[PDB]
Design a protein around this ligand. Structure first.
Ligand SMILES: Cn1cc(-c2ccc(F)c(CNC(=O)c3cc(Br)ccc3O)c2)cn1
Ligand SMILES: [Zn+2]
Length: 354
């Protein structure tokens, strides 16, 4: 069934790749933000996660929706796990020059997210009206993990997220996570765990881990074979399968935005499930581009099985269950399950329409 899947993959490639003014209007906004935050007391160490990363699209169908992360280095951090949750933490400080820059947001020993996300929101909203180039509107609708959302002109839309960076070892709830040893090798997993980790706020004053940088690195070096996709002798469909899980869910989320049943689902749940299938199917031969449709079916199948059983291990923190009934109720997962099965049986109609 590769014919129709390819056609949808091509439609989407041609709008990512198409000449767009958006990325420019974004870069100039973030560049001004950075220098205005950098000469400030609390944010002098702010930076962009990457460079050349003004164009990260979480919404694979919506190309005018951008996502930027600003990172801040926190040296000698004290992490405390909240309520045995495995994945949510308080931040505190070892205090060497016990007047570290962030000291103005403390609460006894515990670092306050919501205060930071206000001096941050206010410092940005300050230099936003100072902007004379183009139009910039920020809305502070609740849910501050897409913390600050800027709107540039009418179409294009930017989500600014602020993250803490630590260069120490990943927290101990990740110790058994990232089980890539039989796929990407034990020595790549060590290499990856030598990288820094990042914290963002939850919605209490708790923080969660952000592994987008590691996803990115897996996705750009994703084969059991070192030369995967450096050719078309050996071009695989891993990335394409991920794109079709993402597009499947954005389309279902959009088609059913009126009713509320899909609101807790995000691309994070799709990425997670996908990598678990990469771990189950570690050989490049199990991802032949000839077999796009079969491999996609595996992904859809596996995800649906997570829903019905209410189990989807975080890829990095094996004890944390993304589909726990306390995180997402049975009603919802049972709803997503039915909707997807209706797609799968009908050769996914949600695709030929845009
Ligand atoms: C959008 N959203 C994320 C969380 C969340 C919650 C708890 C938690 F521990 C984590 C850890 N992050 C990942 O597992 C992760 C996996 C991949 Br693949 C890529 C990036 C990632 O950050 C995330 C909640 N909403
Ligand atoms: Zn490949």
């Amino acid at each position: 069934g590769a014919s129709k899947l390819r056609a949808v993959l091509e439609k989407l490639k041609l709008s990512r790749d198409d000449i767009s003014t958006a990325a420019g209007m974004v870069k100039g906004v973030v560049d001004h933000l950075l220098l205005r935050l950098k000469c400030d007391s609390a944010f002098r160490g702010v930076g962009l996660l990457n460079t050349g990363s003004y164009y990260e699209h979480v919404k694979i169908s919506a190309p005018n929706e951008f996502d930027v992360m600003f990172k801040l280095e926190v040296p000698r951090i004290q992490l405390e796990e909240y309520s045995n949750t495995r994945a949510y933490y308080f931040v505190k400080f070892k205090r060497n020059p016990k007047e570290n820059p962030l000291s103005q947001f403390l609460e006894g020993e515990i670092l306050s997210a919501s205060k930071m996300l206000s001096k941050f929101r206010k410092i940005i909203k300050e230099e936003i009206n100072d902007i004379k180039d183009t139009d910039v509107i920020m809305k502070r609708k609740r849910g501050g993990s897409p913390a600050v959302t800027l709107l540039i002109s009418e179409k294009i839309s930017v989500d600014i997220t602020l993250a803490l960076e630590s260069k120490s070892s990943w927290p101990a709830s990740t110790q058994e996570g990232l089980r890539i040893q039989n796929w990407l090798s034990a020595k790549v997993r060590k290499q990856l765990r030598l990288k820094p980790f990042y914290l963002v706020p939850k919605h209490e004053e708790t923080w969660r881990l952000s592994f987008s940088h590691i996803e990115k690195e897996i996705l750009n070096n994703h084969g059991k074979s070192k030369t995967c996709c450096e050719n078309k002798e050996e071009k695989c469909c891993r990335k394409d399968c991920l794109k079709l899980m993402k597009y499947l869910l954005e389309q279902l989320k959009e088609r059913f935005k009126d009713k509320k049943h899909l609101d807790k689902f995000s691309s994070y749940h799709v990425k997670t499930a996908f990598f678990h299938v990469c771990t189950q199917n570690p050989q490049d031969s199990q991802w032949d581009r000839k077999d796009l449709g079969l491999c996609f079916d595996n992904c859809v199948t596996y995800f649906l099985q997570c829903l019905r059983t209410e189990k989807l291990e975080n890829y990095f923190i094996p004890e944390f269950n993304l589909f726990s009934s306390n995180l997402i109720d049975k009603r919802s997962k049972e709803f997503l399950t039915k909707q997807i099965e209706y797609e799968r049986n009908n050769e996914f109609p949600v695709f030929d329409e845009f």
